[PDB]
Amino acid sequence: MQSINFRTARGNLSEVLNNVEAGEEVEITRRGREPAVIVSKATFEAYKKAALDAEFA
Amino acid sequence: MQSINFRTARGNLSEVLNNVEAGEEVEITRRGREPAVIVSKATFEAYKKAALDAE
DNA sequence: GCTTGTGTACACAT
DNA sequence: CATGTGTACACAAG
Numbered sequence: 001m002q003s004i005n006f007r008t009a010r011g012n013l014s015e016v017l018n019n020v021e022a023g024e025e026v027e028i029t030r031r032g033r034e035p036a037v038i039v040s041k042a043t044f045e046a047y048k049k050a051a052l053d054a055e056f057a
Numbered sequence: 058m059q060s061i062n063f064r065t066a067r068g069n070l071s072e073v074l075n076n077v078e079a080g081e082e083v084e085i086t087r088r089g090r091e092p093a094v095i096v097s098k099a100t101f102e103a104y105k106k107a108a109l110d111a112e
Numbered sequence: 113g114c115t116t117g118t119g120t121a122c123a124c125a126t
Numbered sequence: 127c128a129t130g131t132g133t134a135c136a137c138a139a140g
Contacts, residue, residue, distance in 0.1 A: 005116070005117090006070070006071070006074070006116070006117055006118085007115085007116050007117060007118090008116090009070070010067055010070050010117090010118090011132090011133080012132095013063070013066070013067045013070070013131085014063070014130070014131055014132085015131095017063070017085065017087060017090070017093055020093050021090060021091050021093070025101075027098060028074065028095070030074060030116085030117070031115095031116065031117070031139085031140065032140085033074070033078060033117095034078050034097065034098070034099070035097075035098040036074055036077050036078070036095050036096065036097060036098060037095070037096055037097075037098050037101040038085070038093050038094070038095050039093065039094055039096065039101065040091055040092070040093055040094070041084055041091070041092040041093055041094045042091060042092075044094045044096065044101070044104065045094075047101075047104045047105055047107040047108075048104055048107070049107075050107035050108075050110040051104055051106060051107035053110065054109065062128090062129065062130090063129070063130060063131085064128085064129050064130060064131090065129090067130085067131085068119085068120075068121095069119095070117095070118085071117070071118055071119085072118095087129090087130075088126070088128095088129060088130065089126090090130095
């Protein structure tokens with residue numbers, strides 16, 4: 001997975017979002033603070049959906 | 058789900074990432090482009106256990 | 113005194 | 127009437 005720092009992430013956000021749209025999952029990191037992932041709403045919405053059909057307790 | 062446009066996301070990204078860390082899922086929209094979602098890595102990693110449909 | 117994060121603002125493009 | 131995208135400045139935090 002691609003991993004880019006905040007400063008770089010923002011300074012290139014368009015290129016990041018373009019990369020994301022191409023199917024790449026990009027990790028956003030910040031000093032100390034917990035990381036995040038930018039992923040296409042479609043993919044992630046379809047992850048959430050497939051997870052919701054798990055016969056577990 | 059919270060939904061912000063690109064210009065606002067780039068200009069408030071720190072506040073966006075703080076919101077996400079608090080458990081929020083944030084939709085980023087772009088003109089004529091498919092939307093993206095910024096989500097906590099922990100949550101995302103857990104949601105990819107959806108890849109237990111592929112199996 | 114670096115690096116990186118955060119606010120912000122300007123200019124051009126769509 | 128706005129939003130996307132490059133970029134650059136300055137201050138804060140580490």
